[PDB]
């Protein structure tokens, strides 16, 4: 897409139609004449383009109305309404830009933001952009939260988010122009390498993969066209459905061997009958011939009843000989058919211990993607967010993804090493109680108009609670938290002195030995300038590898690497890091997944802000005071940096609309 219409696409918006959010702010235009809509729509579309072509300088209203042509630059309040709507909801002037109009001397309103995860930083930066007093509380001693990044000398490797999933309509595209981010592109080629240490051959490699994708589609067909979504009162998981598909494919292979052999016995048993008629005619023939030599032994001259006898036997025997000849005729066809039927026997197995293990690596792939055992994903809903995938190649950050949070953090009041222990929200306002992570005795209290909560879903899930809400979160919110899924997948970073892998392949698999260990070190990434290899621990293995010393984990990595490249090309690693996201108490996991029994609707419940009860009874219903952002709050883009960032942009705009007022709805 290109032109103004490309700006709309690069901003996740239809170019030819008004969104449900715009209908909210411009109800005067959605119900009005289609002419004004196309004006509006063009007026919006051009504005994004101007921001988009130059996202390092603030786009001011004036600059925008300058660069519009008539008739579009005639309604200056339309242009002002549009530009204000966009700026508010983070579609323009977000991220890191030079401000033309400097900050207002005095701020209005006070907001405490729990966490400087990217969602946090994103909102904080927007609220401050809106003239609000904003303080971020941080349990860690660094910003970025689940954007973690190892550094030692020239070694650099993310233990957290590592890939930009395409610039086609990605808000991280904007950020990338706004901050020196070296984005290196990922080469899709990935050789599998089973437990022995040698490549799986293309023939097999391609056919398991083909079956894998075929297997996935089948499951999709079970949930949507056969309604296979409940089973023993419980929701069907993607894992169950994959087994039910394989089983129905293993049953089909047998069902078609049975059919084959059954045809074979139908012929063999029909051939049997044929031979019976032939071994019975050869003895009517045996006896007739005897009778004929006897009748022909009577030398002539003979009376007619004896001449007729020889001729009659001669006729009768010929008849039988014709008859038996027409049956070794038929005894011939069937014999041919039998070599045909046997000659074309159908497949003996659906998949075998070889097949079934490369298939397990494609399941470890899924498990790593959703950071969870396929038994926990929702069959119906696990892929609900896939309509909104970005276009374009998948990318890495050669200087580490950290450089983005760090960039966002400049200019912001960040209290590091401050763990929130309790959040109290009332009609007159809120107060957050935090401690010092270093010395737990020191206690802090922050009073504010509203709290923006970017605590991880794993944190929110914790029992017993790491953060107390006063009053408690309502049931509808806390059941969304249970119902949802917060998965886990750790990494192992291997720093060497020299490159001993194929330097033009970025990533290569290792095929595990068991279904149970399909995730244990099943993928290595070569992404970085320095000699660093990065190993994934996914699926059921991720949870368990956390109860194992790094040394032991590195041993397994070294053993796997040695088999691939030989016991002597693989040196000792200079620097080693394996983390623990499920054990990290400021994460308690890696990212969210649509659990079985959840839906994407739960992601919407997570984002509804909380409005407390009135102080004095009979007082008018108050303002909402507790707001939620973060990866597990953006239904369409869960567990995926833009999604975090996008959710922080969302809350900032909706908090400002609340505490600063919307001067663009009139």
């Amino acid at each position: 897409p290109s032109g103004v219409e490309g700006a709309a696409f690069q901003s996740r918006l239809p170019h030819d139609r008004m969104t449900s959010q715009e209908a909210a702010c411009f109800p005067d235009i959605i119900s009005g004449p289609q002419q004004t809509q196309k004006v509006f729509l063009f007026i919006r579309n051009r504005t994004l383009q101007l921001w988009l072509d130059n996202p390092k300088i603030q786009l001011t209203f004036e600059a925008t109305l300058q660069q519009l042509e008539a008739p579009y630059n005639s309604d200056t309040v339309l242009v002002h309404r549009v530009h204000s709507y966009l700026e508010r909801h983070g579609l323009i002037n977000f991220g890191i830009y030079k401000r033309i109009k400097p900050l207002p001397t005095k701020k209005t309103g006070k907001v405490i933001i729990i966490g400087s995860g990217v969602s946090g930083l994103a909102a904080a930066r927007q609220l401050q952009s809106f003239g609000m007093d904003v303080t971020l509380l941080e349990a860690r001693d660094r910003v970025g939260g689940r954007v973690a990044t190892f550094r030692k000398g020239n070694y650099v490797a993310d233990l957290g988010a590592m890939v930009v999933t395409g610039l086609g309509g990605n808000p991280m595209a904007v950020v990338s122009k706004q901050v020196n981010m070296e984005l290196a592109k990922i080469k899709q080629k990935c050789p599998l390498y089973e437990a022995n240490g040698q490549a799986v051959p293309k023939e097999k490699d391609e056919m398991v993969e083909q079956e894998f994708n075929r297997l996935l589609e089948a499951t999709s067909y079970l949930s949507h066209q056969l309604d296979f979504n409940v089973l023993n009162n419980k929701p069907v998981s993607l894992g169950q459905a994959l087994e039910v598909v394989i089983q129905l494919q293993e049953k089909h292979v047998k069902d078609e061997q049975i059919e084959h052999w059954k045809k074979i016995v139908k012929t063999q048993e029909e051939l049997k009958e044929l031979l019976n008629k032939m071994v019975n005619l050869k003895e009517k023939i045996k006896e007739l011939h005897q009778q004929y030599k006897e009748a022909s032994e009577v030398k002539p001259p003979r009376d007619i009843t004896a001449e007729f006898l020889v001729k009659s036997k001669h006729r009768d025997l010929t008849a039988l000989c014709k008859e038996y000849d027409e049956l070794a005729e038929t005894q011939g066809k069937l014999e041919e058919k039998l070599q045909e039927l046997e000659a074309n026997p159908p497949s003996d197995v659906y998949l075998s211990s070889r097949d079934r293990q490369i298939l397990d690596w494609h399941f470890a792939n899924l498990e790593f993607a959703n950071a969870t055992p396929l038994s926990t994903l929702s069959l119906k809903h696990w892929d609900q967010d896939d309509d909104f995938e970005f276009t374009g190649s998948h990318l890495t950050v050669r200087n580490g993804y950290s450089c983005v949070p760090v960039a966002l953090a400049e200019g912001l009041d960040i209290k590091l090493n401050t763990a929130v222990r309790q959040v109290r929200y009332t009609a007159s306002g809120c107060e957050v109680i935090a401690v010092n992570t270093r010395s737990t005795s020191q206690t802090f209290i922050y009073k504010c108009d509203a709290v923006l909560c970017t605590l991880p879903l794993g944190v929110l899930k914790q029992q017993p609670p790491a953060v107390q809400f006063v009053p408690p979160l309502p049931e509808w919110k806390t059941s969304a938290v249970q119902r949802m899924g917060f998965g886990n997948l750790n990494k192992v970073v291997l720093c060497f002195d020299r490159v001993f892998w194929d330097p033009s392949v970025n990533l290569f698999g290792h095929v595990g030995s068991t279904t149970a260990s399909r995730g244990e070190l099943f993928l290595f990434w070569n992404l970085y300038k320095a000699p660093i290899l990065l190993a994934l621990v996914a699926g059921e293995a991720a949870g368990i590898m956390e109860n194992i010393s790094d040394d032991v984990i590195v041993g397994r990595c070294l053993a796997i690497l040695k088999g691939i490249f030989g016991s002597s090309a693989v040196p000792q690693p200079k620097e080693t890091v394996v983390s623990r996201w499920r054990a990290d108490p400021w994460a308690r996991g890696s990212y969210s997944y649509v659990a079985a029994g959840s839906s994407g609707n739960d992601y919407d419940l997570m984002a509804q802000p909380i409005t407390p009860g009135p102080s004095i009874p009979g007082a008018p219903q108050p303002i909402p005071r507790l707001f939620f952002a973060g990866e597990h709050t953006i239904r369409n883009y869960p567990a995926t940096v833009h999604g975090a960032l996008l959710s922080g942009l969302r809350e900032a705009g909706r908090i400002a609309d609340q505490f600063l007022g919307a001067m663009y709805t009139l």
């Binding site: 993607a369 959703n370 896939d386 993928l523 995926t640």
Partner: peptide, 9 residues
């Protein structure tokens, strides 16, 4: 998310 899938078809 399904978008993290490696070697996507």
């Amino acid at each position: 998310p399904r978008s993290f899938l490696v070697r996507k078809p």
